[PDB]
Design a binder for this molecule. Structure first.
Ligand SMILES: CC(C)[C@]1(C)CC(=O)N(Cc2cc(F)cc(C(=O)N[C@@H](C)c3ccccc3)c2)C(N)=N1
Ligand SMILES: *[C@@H]1O[C@H](CO)[C@@H](O)[C@H](O)[C@H]1NC(C)=O
Length: 339
């Protein structure tokens, strides 16, 4: 069932690595900063039942069920094993407000939240925008529950991620539920069908580094992940990519001499009909131009295990350049040049 509603959520951009918006949970609402994530399918926030021996729980907003009159107990154990690590807790149900839409939702109350990486997170929790097929504990995802209300104009949602500004007047980003915002893209959308329903993943035909370097020659997979900061490839693909760029490996990231940053070649992703090109300004964190300082690249290695991986992941680095529409009705992803 389709309605006429379109709901937008304004996002805050933290350092071009974290894009989060607000949701309200319970009666009266308890607010949380959340990443709207196409790479996962569960909703979770830290819980008041999280031991304060997990320091990430000291520095984040905690959901207190004892303060909500609309809360409904469940209690089923929940373990979410992600590429960044594990969080665990239990299931709870309450009313969630997201951009004006009110939805009764089953979510995770996280009681175990590791300092690495969550002490680095400016957000509190996660709103999984992925499919029911990948939902842990077979919990109905929030977008499926919103769709069931038959209020949305279309069975789609869109992401706009802005470049980081120091001006408070700057919109960090925007998620549209039920459509796309023509003020944040130009030209037309070009769609790529999903390999299969259940994962926001598409076929990739090749990766080009300048003129003389080529990866993904026989085709590969591309997960379009709004919850990832950087573009990621397998360890093997990234070693070849970085060698081609003249970048050196550190503990978790890759760097170039800052003065060399503006000279780096274009990187192109062949998706569906089109080539999606990122210049060095799109993937280098150009913090200085010094021959004496190292500048980080917004690309790294991540070995995603089967059945989803091995796969590349097109994170915030890609979405900043290309406004993205996630189409559930047609099982496809549309890209248009962001503005
Ligand atoms: C949002 C994040 C907690 C989860 C739920 C789990 C995860 O591992 N990724 C993929 C992924 C893969 C990866 F290599 C890096 C990051 C990542 O750094 N995401 C940012 C948003 C972040 C910052 C601070 C703490 C955690 C995560 C995310 C994802 N899509 N969603
Ligand atoms: C938790 O919710 C699920 C929803 O399908 C239900 O099957 C399960 O029995 C619930 N558990 C309790 C103890 O309420």
């Amino acid at each position: 069932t389709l309605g006429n509603t379109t709901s937008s959520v304004i996002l805050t951009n933290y350092m071009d690595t974290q894009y989060y918006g607000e949701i309200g949970i319970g009666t009266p609402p308890q607010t949380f900063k959340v990443v709207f994530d196409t790479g996962s399918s569960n909703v979770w926030v830290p819980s008041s039942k999280c031991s304060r021996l997990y320091t990430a729980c000291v520095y984040h907003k905690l959901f207190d069920a004892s303060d909500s009159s609309s809360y409904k107990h469940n209690g089923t154990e929940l373990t979410l094993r992600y590429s960044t690590g594990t969080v665990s807790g239990f299931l709870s149900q309450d009313i969630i407000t997201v951009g004006g839409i009110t939805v009764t939702q089953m979510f995770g109350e996280v009681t175990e939240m590791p300092a690495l990486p969550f002490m680095l997170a400016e957000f509190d929790g996660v709103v999984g925008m992925g499919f029911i097929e990948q939902a842990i504990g077979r919990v109905t995802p929030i977008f499926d529950n919103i769709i069931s209300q038959g209020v949305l104009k279309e069975d789609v949602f869109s992401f706009y991620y802005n470049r980081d500004s120091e001006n408070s007047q700057s919109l960090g980003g925007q998620i549209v539920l039920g459509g796309s915002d023509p003020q944040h893209y130009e030209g037309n959308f070009h769609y790529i069908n999903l390999i299969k329903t259940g994962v926001w993943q598409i076929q990739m035909k090749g990766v080009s580094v300048g003129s003389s370097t080529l990866l993904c020659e026989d085709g590969c997979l591309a997960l379009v992940d709004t919850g990832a900061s950087y573009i990621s490839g397998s360890t093997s693909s990234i070693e070849k990519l970085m060698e081609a760029l003249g970048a050196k490996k550190r503990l978790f990231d890759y760097v170039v001499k800052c003065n060399e940053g503006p000279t780096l070649p274009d990187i192109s992703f062949h998706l569906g009909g089109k080539e999606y090109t990122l210049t060095s300004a799109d993937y280098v964190f150009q913090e200085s131009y010094s021959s004496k300082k190292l500048c980080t690249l917004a690309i790294h290695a991540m070995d995603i295990p089967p059945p989803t991986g091995p796969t590349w992941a097109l994170g915030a680095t890609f979405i900043r350049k290309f406004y993205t529409e996630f189409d559930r009705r047609n099982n496809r992803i549309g890209f248009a040049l962001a503005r």
